[PDB]
Amino acid sequence: GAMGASRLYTLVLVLQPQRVLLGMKKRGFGAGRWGGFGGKVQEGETIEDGARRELQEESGLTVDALHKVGQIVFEFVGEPELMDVHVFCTDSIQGTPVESDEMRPCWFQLDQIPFKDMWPDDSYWFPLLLQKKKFHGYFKFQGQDTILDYTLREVDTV
Template sequence: MYIRKLYTLVFLRNDTHILLGLKKRGFGVNKWNGFGGKVEADETILDAALRELKEECCVTVDRDNLKNIGHLEFTFTGEPTLMDVRVFSATVFEGTPTETDEMSPKWFPYTEIPFEDMWPDDVIWFPYMLKDKLFFGKFHYKGYDTILNYNVEELESMQKFYHDKTK
């Protein structure tokens, strides 16, 4: 049995580019990723996504412009935690993405996403996001670089993943 921990992951996008951040410290250091982190006990998932985005790249998004597009679950051999990650996307935002002590943001054309410097699972589920498809994925890792097994499926709706804390 795993201990479920809730996280957020936010991507800013336009028709041709995606904003990624190079992680400068902590879990995932030196990897390109979206912006996000742990959901605190006193906040909703959406509030956590908005807070993490602002903390990590100095950008704000109106609640109505942040769309829940995916749900990912990660487990790691020998570790008791299941990382329950809610994935969000926004195309409308305020502010200029700015480097912080945790992340260094950079826009990438969709044709030049640096998958070789990202988590190995990203290359598997990013195509769903880039085609504006809703998705659910489960990944089981050995260490942090080897995927032992996975399953990703396209969803019609994110409704089954909504609970009171997401509203």
């Protein structure tokens, strides 16, 4: 039948030549994992404005200019609504990251990407992000650890 309805999310990676900024989620769904900064797009908000807003709210960083790098759809067994995540990256920042109620930030060298403490799907698409290759992906999860199905492709245009 019809593909499930999806909720629009953004996800932002601050990716510099030698390091990436990640936030450890302090509470809720996915708590205890390092990831990018993101959340739900609000009514009337452009996707990129939502991405900038999520970065500011969760990390304190203000950036003008994000680059679209990928789209990932997440599905969780037992929940009919999908997560439609638009992924962005920026290399140029001009402030300091701060701990927020949602996220605790640390910088990671790019030979120390903390995959063991990141969502399992990141092992597949994060390498494409690091190579500056655009991608579309889909991951079906049983709970937070187990992938039952996934698709992934490199694209020329997101």
